[PDB]
Amino acid sequence: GTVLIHVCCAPDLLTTIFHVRDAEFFFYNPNIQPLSEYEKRREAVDKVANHFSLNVRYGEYSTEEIRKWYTAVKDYKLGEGSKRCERCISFLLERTAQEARKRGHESFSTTLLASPRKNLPMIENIGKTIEEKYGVKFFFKNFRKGGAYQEGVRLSKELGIYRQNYCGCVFSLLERRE
């Protein structure tokens, strides 16, 4: 009855932990470029985990791992919200479900469900598709409900947690400029 929860960023982790109790977290995001930004986001997650004694596992981040992600999304390099993001989130959640099976967790989820930008129907579709493939149950919750999003905002402010202004990939950084 344990869940492995992919973590995109510390602000969305803060929103999520208002609602989840006995979870292992999995910080895996080869979509975040460049390395300096990956490390800044990772350190914010580490700060939250130390503050609240969370159990966080950190996934692979390497030139090889980034190349695998880029292959998955390359054919739609379109805007945010399109087939490119469907491929990106499926890549992240596939790796998470793989890890969940390896570590004995019967369920998996993602803090992307707490992000106000993301498309919840798209994420739930991806999660349920991956559930069918790996036999790890996808746990869906609107993590922003119950006032948790605003609750994540005030914890982020009090803790001094880095709050990014682009989704993470190079494409989203360019779309930020335009």
Ligand SMILES: Nc1nc2c(ncn2[C@@H]2O[C@H](COP(=O)(O)O)[C@@H](O)[C@H]2O)c(=O)[nH]1
């Ligand atoms: N700082 C912060 N970023 C978030 C949060 N939730 C999702 N994000 C990500 O940060 C990106 C910031 O993009 P923008 O704020 O320019 O729209 C979003 O598109 C999303 O991918 C959050 O709660 N706080």
Ligand code: SF4
């Ligand atoms: S905008 Fe976000 S979800 Fe879409 S491809 Fe880039 S990192 Fe992935």
Ligand SMILES: [Cl-]
């Ligand atoms: Cl995010």
Ligand SMILES: [Fe+3]
């Ligand atoms: Fe996030």
